[PDB]
Amino acid sequence: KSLKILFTALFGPGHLNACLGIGSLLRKRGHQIYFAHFPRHRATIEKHGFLFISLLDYAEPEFPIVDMLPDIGIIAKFAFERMHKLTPLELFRHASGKHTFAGMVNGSKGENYAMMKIVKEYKPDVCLADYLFNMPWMFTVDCPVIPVKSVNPIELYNGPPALTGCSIHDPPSVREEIEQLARKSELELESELEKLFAHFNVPLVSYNYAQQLGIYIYPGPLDYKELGSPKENWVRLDSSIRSSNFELPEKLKDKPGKLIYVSMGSLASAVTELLTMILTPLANSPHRFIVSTGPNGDSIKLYDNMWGDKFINQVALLPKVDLFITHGGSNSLIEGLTAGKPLIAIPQFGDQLDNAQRIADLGLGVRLNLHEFSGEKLLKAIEDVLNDEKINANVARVSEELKKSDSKDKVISLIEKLARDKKL
């Protein structure tokens, strides 16, 4: 029996891209996939064979729906300026118990109204949604809803607080304070969600509760097995890659060195100062760089050893590079490791700090922090990682694991079962 499956996600292309991958698996099984998201992604969604639904067409008049990607960058400038000078601890101190994505909770009412209307009209058998936190509609619509998580999944475990970037090597005395601050700001997230749920008259749940089934996308070899098991009803999908041939810019043909990809993500690349800071020293690195220059890419200066465009084909490119300098977004991490490339992660915000530290902790690359950044340090990191026989072997081992994953079969079966039975 072929199902009607409805997806949605946050604005961020990181979240959209994770769901595209799951959607593709379900489409292959014979299901009709709908995806409710913003008009800028209609092409990718429809190219995947999914029916596009504009959340903008379902908005209530008193509660409009910004697609925030254009507004982000204005926000991200402030974030960059703080972390570039403050240590993570000082950042948490300066935050004064303000949570990372709490300010986003209030603004989510409009998207909630839209989803209630969409689900009522389209009457799917099941929904999947990739958000930073649970939303009231997920508990009021008349079908099972599965949260999809693509951020670092330490939040699903009972060990160190998420978003702090703690290392397995940090001793008790060092984490005590950052863990107090993290726990304090978690209370702000709860109080913000209380207001949102109260608005819609829905009983409050944990921000990462999965009623029946939740799917987190993270490579099994990097998952937090040393913390036991994730929260109830959460199941791991080892990767989610949406899924062709790529040709190398002639600029970089017959230049010396390895090929290195630089991308600071979809969100953070908006901030031109960040890329400028990073690329400046790389002019003197004896290698060839392909750069994702972001929305404001045209005014970024590139050197003789660099070719860039606003938006690059990351999945096509990665097999052809030797190293990936990344902000440490989850998707980028999964794509880089699938391709078997080592990582230099320069975390900017949120879960990236957790991913960056996990890369370091498991010998898959190095973390560099903004606050102590130097061109000397970066160039050395490049040479070190390129010639570190241990890191490359670890990456090759994880790369092999990721390719042979059969997590998809189990997860699909669960999705199908839940849709049909309405329970378990």
Ligand X SMILES: O=c1ccn([C@@H]2O[C@H](COP(=O)(O)OP(=O)(O)O)[C@@H](O)[C@H]2O)c(=O)[nH]1
Ligand Y SMILES: O=c1c(O)c(-c2ccc(O)c(O)c2)oc2cc(O)cc(O)c12
- Which residue positions form the known binding site? 14, 17, 242, 266-267, 292, 311-312, 314, 327, 330-332, 335, 351-352
Gyration radius from the chain CA atoms: 21
With CB cut-offs between 5 and 8 Å by kind, which of ligand X, ligand Y, none does residue 331 bind? ligand X
Q: Is 312 in the site for ligand X (CB under 6 A)?
A: yes
Query: Binding to ligand Y (CB under 6 A): which residues in 6-35?
Result: 10, 12
With CB cut-offs between 5 and 8 Å by kind, which of ligand X, ligand Y, none does residue 75 bind? ligand Y
Q: Which is nearer to ligand X, 33 or 317 (CB)?
A: 317
CA distances in angstroms from 126 to 229, 364, 410, listed in the order given: 26, 37, 17
Among 305, 314, 338, 407, binds ligand X (CB under 6 A): 314
Q: For tokens 């200066």, what's the residue?
A: 301
Alpha carbon 262 to chain centroid, angstroms? 17
Q: From the CB of residue 307, how many other CB atoms can be counted at a distance below 10 Å?
A: 18
Q: Do 34 and 53 touch, CB atoms closer than 8 A?
A: yes
Query: Binding to ligand Y (CB under 6 A): which residues in 218-277?
Result: 267
Residue 268 CA to residue 273 CA, distance in Å, equals: 10
| Residue whose C-alpha is closest to residue 276's, from 288, 256, 262, 257 | 262
In angstroms, what is the minimal distance from the CB of 397 to ligand X? Answer: 22
Among 75, 241, 283, 386, binds ligand Y (CB under 6 A): 75
Q: Is 350 in the site for ligand Y (CB under 6 A)?
A: yes
Among 39, 49, 64, 103, binds ligand Y (CB under 6 A): 103
Reported as type and span, the H/E element at residue 306 is strand 306-309
Give the SS3 label for residue 310: coil
Residues in the chain, overall count: 424
Pairing between strand 145-149 and 234-237?
unpaired
Around 154, how many Cα atoms within 13 Å sit in the side-chain half-sphere? 23
Give the SS3 label for residue 358: helix
Reported as type and span, the H/E element at residue 30 is none
Percentage helix, strand, coil for the chain under 3-state DSSP, each rounded to 5: 45, 15, 40
Among 25, 51, 56, 68, binds ligand Y (CB under 6 A): 68
Interface region with ligand Y, contact rule CB under 6 A, candidates 67-75, 199-207, 320-328, 369-377 = 67-75
In angstroms, what is the minimal distance from the CB of 14 to ligand X? Answer: 3
Q: Which is nearer to ligand Y, 34 or 101 (CB)?
A: 101
Q: Is 311 in the site for ligand X (CB under 6 A)?
A: yes
Query: Binding to ligand X (CB under 6 A): which residues in 317-336?
Result: 327, 329-332, 335
Q: Is 101 in the site for ligand Y (CB under 6 A)?
A: yes
Binding residues for UDP: 17, 242, 266-267, 292, 311-312, 314, 327, 330-332, 335
Q: Do 146 and 216 touch, CB atoms closer than 8 A?
A: no
With CB cut-offs between 5 and 8 Å by kind, which of ligand Y, ligand X, none does residue 230 bind? none
With CB cut-offs between 5 and 8 Å by kind, which of ligand X, ligand Y, none does residue 314 bind? ligand X
Q: Is 347 in the site for ligand X (CB under 6 A)?
A: no
Q: Is 240 in the site for ligand X (CB under 6 A)?
A: no
Interface region with ligand X, contact rule CB under 6 A, candidates 108-116, 215-223, 264-272, 359-367 = 264-272
CA distances in angstroms from 254 to 7, 27, 257, 261, 333, listed in the order given: 46, 43, 9, 17, 29
Q: Is 328 in the site for ligand Y (CB under 6 A)?
A: no
In angstroms, what is the minimal distance from the CB of 10 to ligand X? Answer: 10
| Residue whose C-alpha is closest to residue 270's, from 293, 287, 254 | 293
Q: DSSP string covering 60-81, please?
A: BTTB-----TTTTTHHHHHHHH
In angstroms, what is the minimal distance from the CB of 41 to ligand X? Answer: 11
Residue type, 225: K
In angstroms, what is the minimal distance from the CB of 100 to ligand Y? Answer: 4
How many residues belong to the site for ligand X (CB under 6 A)? 20
Query: Binding to ligand X (CB under 6 A): which residues in 194-223?
Result: none
How many residues belong to the site for ligand Y (CB under 6 A)? 12
∠ CA(25), CA(30), CA(32), 5° rounding?
A: 90
∠ CA(322), CA(403), CA(407), 5° rounding?
A: 140
Q: Which is nearer to ligand X, 31 or 327 (CB)?
A: 327
Q: Is 21 in the site for ligand X (CB under 6 A)?
A: no
Residues near ligand Y, by CB under 6 A: 10, 12, 68, 71-72, 75, 100-101, 103-104, 267, 350
Residues near ligand X, by CB under 6 A: 12-14, 17, 263, 265-268, 292, 311-312, 314-315, 327, 329-332, 335
